[PDB]
DNA sequence: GGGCTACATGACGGCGAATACCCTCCCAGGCC
């Protein structure tokens, strides 16, 4: 109860990238502020939060899927496996572990999941936190390698304006094959 | 200017457009941005506030 | 001889910035 430590996973569907996942361990030896949630606050407010909770937490995780890999099982087995690859990442073993959401997977320590655990779970959200900034730095990283599409505004998510670059210029070896738009766009839809 | 060329969100577009008219405007005039920090306070003449 | 301490609550519209809400598609595996 005292080694507790909750991941959470972030870019779970959007279009292009693979999905990215964190689990950050943290007690009460040291002081933790402003770490309610990740989704109502604003970007710079997550920029001191990835850098705070990086050198409050005694330990930091990390675990993305693949294109080919996450479109070879959906993002229903990916985004497990990308978790369980990131709680077998973490330096220190946890007694407990965290899942947003009802589900959990095959692990040998005793895990459980905790709906919208993002509100109530200071672990669940820095965990969010640093797995969302590492998304953003990567779509960063696309939108300089690729400018034409605008990954570093939308974060590749199904916008009207990804709908219609994708539309326009086509999908590259990052995009997620398997979902509808993109099929369209090479024509493997049926 | 550099980022507004890249954005693409109407309302960061605007707010982006109305903060490059004000810096443009700071540029363009002999105004600082410190002159608005009063360090030393006018007074009116005393005939035009008088007893 | 001489200076100092410097509460209402009974107002309606509109417009524009500040946020809080419903668009926007796109995933699945048990219920119809």
Redesign the pocket.
Known sequence: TQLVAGVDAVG??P?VGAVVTAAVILDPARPIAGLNDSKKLSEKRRLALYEEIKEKALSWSLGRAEPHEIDEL????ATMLAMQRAVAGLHIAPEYVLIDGNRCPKLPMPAMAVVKGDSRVPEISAASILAKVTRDAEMAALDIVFPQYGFAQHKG??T?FH?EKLAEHGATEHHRR????VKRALGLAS | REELNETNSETKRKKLT?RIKLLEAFVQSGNKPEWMILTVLPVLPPDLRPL
């Not at chain 1, 398997?178 to 738009?181: L, Q, Y």
């Open positions: 779970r569907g279009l959906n993002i229903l087995h998510y199904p009207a709908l398997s979902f509808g738009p | 109305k």
